Amino acid sequence: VVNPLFEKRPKNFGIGQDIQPKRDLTRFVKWPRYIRLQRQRAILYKRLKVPPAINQFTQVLDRQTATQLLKLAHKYRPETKQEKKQRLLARAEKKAAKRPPVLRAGVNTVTTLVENKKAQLVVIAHDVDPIELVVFLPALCRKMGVPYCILKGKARLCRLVHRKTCTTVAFTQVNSEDKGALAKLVEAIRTNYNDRYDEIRRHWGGNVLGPKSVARIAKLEKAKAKELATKLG
Amino acid sequence: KIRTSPTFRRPKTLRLRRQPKYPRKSAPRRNKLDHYAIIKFPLTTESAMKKIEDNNTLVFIVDVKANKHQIKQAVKKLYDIDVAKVNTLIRPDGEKKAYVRLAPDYDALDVANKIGII
RNA sequence: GUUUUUUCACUGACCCGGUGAGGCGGGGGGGCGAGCCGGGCUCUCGCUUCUGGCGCCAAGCGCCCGGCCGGCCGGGCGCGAC
RNA sequence: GCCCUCAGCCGAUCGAAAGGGAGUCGGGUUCAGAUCCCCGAAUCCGGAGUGGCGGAGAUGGGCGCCGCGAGGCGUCCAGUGC
Q1: Which residues contact A89 (CB under 8 A, 6 or more apart)?
Q2: Which residues lie within the region annotated Beta-like import receptor binding (BIB) domain (chain B)?
Q3: Which positions of strand C lie within 7 Å of protein CB atoms?
Q4: Which nucleotide is closest to the Cα of B57 by its C1'?
Q5: CB of A229 lies under 7 Å from some atom of strand C
Q6: A215 touches strand C (CB under 7 A)
Q7: Are A149 and A69 in contact (CB under 8 A)?
Q8: Cβ(A214)–Cβ(A207) under 8 Å?
Q9: Which of A199, A228, A203 shows the shortest CA–CA distance to A51?
């Protein structure tokens, strides 16, 4: 049926028999210094010992509660910068012919109203680069009795309002229509983050080395466990 | 896509060209060295005129910045005469001495009598 | 739980070698052979030793699409170095 | 102009008028110049848009016949050499 002139030619890839093809060499390619540094910086969090003041950043609120908090924060978003100029033009036309409650931002505005006791919920990023801004605020909100959550993405937290980045978000004033849905989130965040802070203080972390070192230790551990099963008996 | 070469090669990223709003200088430089200034004078020596009568050549004193083709173009633009070849030297006094070979249809003594020198 | 000394061993600090930073560590698969009772345990192995040439730009199986009038022409993606 | 695809080298550059280092011989010529000016014969390199032409490539072998034979019709191929 088929043409017998065509011949199968199996090139057996062997040492001294045939040339070897290429391979994905993503570990073997000499990476640049800045790429290698920013890749090993994330490795440094696993290798070295982590104090609880940094280990408290690892607790991240889950997806359903995070999307519910984003949907609740979508209702009280501030207006556009062009709408600000249009409202000023409308005020000028009203003059020629009371603010609504919004959501605050920035630590210098938020932390003052923390001790003034006006906020109800705090939103913090998880991997912000000025890490010294955050540290004292969960320990202080524990004593004040203000719930704080740690969400994913300072960029997407800042791009909700007409800004680029945002450090902390405070929920100061809400209406009666969006009260119970906010109170359920307050109760969930209080049971998640606040009510186990005594275990956060005592919960040490880190000291997780490479998988090659873990396998090399576990091989000798399984070897000793096998030798003790038949050594004396 | 797989990492073929172990050496990290920098890709062809970007470069641009000049798209200015206004140029640097206002008045550009014009042609300063003119055709009347590039050819100074011929030499009226008796032995030079004997060489002109013998081998049908011309001896000019040329500016040092000129080339052998530039002498040909400068003579062809002004006097409208063909040039066979140009042979130049530089005197120890500091002047270039050319040897313009003419074609035999236009005589060198005749073109000297046209311009007036003898 | 706190403090002094000895024994060890890491690695994430520090010192040194080479490269074109080219086949690192585990799980899993296959031929052959071993003891125990066709099942299971782990070990073994992973293509080149006859003479001064050499193997460089894959074959082969599948999964789909476009154009022309069921047939011709031209392409893409996998298995093929778990 | 963009998207695919491919390429190695020891690192810019300087450094020999006794290193490597294409492409002219004779004759006469001025008061001073001769591989330099002139005569007569030559040689190498670069470009060329339609490369302007000669020559291989290039012209043959088999079938049906017409045609006394020459020679030409249709049907299959060979050709980037002896």
Answers
A1: none
A2: 1-36
A3: 10-12, 20-26, 47-48, 55-61, 81
A4: D37
A5: no
A6: yes
A7: yes
A8: no
A9: A203
